[PDB]
Amino acid sequence: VGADVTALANKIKPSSGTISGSYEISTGKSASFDVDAAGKITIGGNAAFLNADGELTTNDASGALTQATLDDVLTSVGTEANSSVTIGGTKYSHSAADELS
Amino acid sequence: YKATTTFNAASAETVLSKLEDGNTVAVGGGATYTYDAAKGNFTYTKTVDTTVGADVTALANKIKPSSGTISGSYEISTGKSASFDVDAAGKITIGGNAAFLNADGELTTNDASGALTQATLDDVLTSVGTEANSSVTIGGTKYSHSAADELSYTAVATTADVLSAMGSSTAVSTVTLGSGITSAAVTFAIATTDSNNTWVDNK
Amino acid sequence: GELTDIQTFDTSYKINADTGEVTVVGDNSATAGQYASADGAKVLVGSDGKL
Amino acid sequence: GELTDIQTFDTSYKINADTGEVTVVGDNSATAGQYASADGAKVLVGSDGKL
């Protein structure tokens, strides 16, 4: 991949391409989330928007530049601008060895 | 014979009898609070004082004692549509997590770390519309500390909760019937067909 | 006899010729918000009332 | 109706507003044991955040 992170995102997607819950989004350093996904990332009783372009932390507080998408999270998490982060939950852990400059 | 009868009248107890528009009170050079008699109650807005340049901590230390104890199920609505459900034992935490804060200038509750996280309550109070957010609030435990303005450290902010307290016109009359240097004022007729009425502060 | 600069609302005399409030309609939901000082209070059609 | 000049100790009325309590961080225990006079009171965080 060069700038086409979508290939990696859509390769990750079929490994968990179903509506599930209790997903673990550990982005940045100490995210440690317990969220749900039904085609859109959300935590119990909230929306869990995405924030901080270049830092890419998932947060329910809007910052006028929020998307709140599972594809956006997967492209962000350790695959665009994060290092040593992982998508846990559902008895797998997609750790990120390298980020996309 | 020329008898000059005086007519000194129009005190608080009679002006409030004919009132539908807004009401206000103000003491000396201090903050001014406004009211509005709606459905037998006055929609008083408890606007926390501003009196600050770069010392933002004053508003936080004024609003903290309003809820200055360990509680839970707090509602943190920052940014635009935050609507969190947060616990606070002196530290801001969401259910089962840590709920850090990051994104200075935008100031969202960053429960996912972004290398510049603090995760504490006083930083939240300074953060939530007190410095760099607009039309945001903290709910939960029956209040909504909305932010009328944000502190650019030159323009001054204020946290406000519309308690709707003080509503009874009987209490309004009593409080305006006796104060310090509080010279109040009422507009109490049609916007086209009214003026303003002040009074002596102390009675 | 018409006051150019003074008008009347449904209740009393006002200096405002037109209220002109702005309503925003949700896309994914049929409900319509308020793009005004209400700022999100859901609008409803009253009993024989306009809205 | 409060006073800044005269404060109250935890059990008494002392003018000295500050006590300078001495706590020791128990190494390998991570518990701030008391050191000043209680000598191992095992300080806990109160409901208001103070020690």
Q: Which 3-state string (H, E, C) describes B51-110?
A: CCCCCCHHHHHHHHHHHCCCEEEEEEECCCCCCCCEEECCCEEECCCCCCCECCCCCECC
Other Cβ atoms within 10 Å of A33 Cβ, number: 23
Judge contact between B70 and B62, C-beta under 8 A: no
Query: What kind and span of H or E run contains B37?
Result: strand B32-38
In the DSSP assignment, the letter for residue B202 is T
Longest dimension (CA), chain B: 90
Please report the resolution in angstroms: 3.7
Give the C-alpha separation, D21 to B160, whole Å.
Answer: 38
Written as six digits, the tokens of A99 are 């980020």
Q: Do D47 and B69 touch (CB under 8 A)?
A: yes
Identify the three-state secondary structure at position C41: coil
Partners of chain A (3+ Cβ pairs below 8 A)? B
Gyration radius from chain D CA atoms = 14
Partners of chain D (3+ Cβ pairs below 8 A)? B
In the DSSP assignment, the letter for residue B27 is B
D47 lies within 8 A of chain B by CB: yes
Q: Which of residues 42-81 of B touch D (CB under 8 A)?
A: 68-70
| Chain B residues whose beta carbon lies within 8 Å of the beta carbon of residue D45 | 90
Q: Do B70 and D45 touch (CB under 8 A)?
A: no
Helix ranges restricted to H, chain D: none
| Chain D residues whose beta carbon lies within 8 Å of the beta carbon of residue B69 | 47-48
Gyration radius from chain C CA atoms = 15
The minimum CA-CA distance between A50 and chain B, rounded to whole Å, is 10
Q: Would you call A94 exposed, middle or buried from its count of C-beta atoms within 10 A (0-12, 13-18, 19+)?
A: middle
- Are chains A and D touching, using the cut-off of 8 Å on CB pairs and a minimum of 3 such pairs? no
How far from chain centre, in Å, is Cα B11?
27
Judge contact between A34 and B96, C-beta under 8 A: yes
C14 lies within 8 A of chain B by CB: yes
Query: What kind and span of H or E run contains B25?
Result: strand B22-26
Give the C-alpha separation, A14 to B96, whole Å.
Answer: 29
- Are chains D and B touching, using the cut-off of 8 Å on CB pairs and a minimum of 3 such pairs? yes
- Partnered with residue B33 across adjacent β-strands are B25
B22 contacts: CB under 8 Å, gap ≥ 6: B34, B35, B36, B186, B187
Sheet holding A41-43, edge to edge: A41-43, A35-37, A20-26, A86-88, A94-95
Judge contact between D31 and D39, C-beta under 8 A: no
Buried/exposed code over C31-41 (b: 16+ C-beta within 10 A; e: otherwise): eebeeeeeeee
- Method in brief: cryo-EM
Written as six digits, the tokens of B75 are 């509602």
Give the C-alpha separation, B44 to B163, whole Å.
Answer: 7
Judge contact between A24 and A36, C-beta under 8 A: no
Best of B190, B193, B194 to disrupt the C interface (most C CBs within 10 Å) is: B190
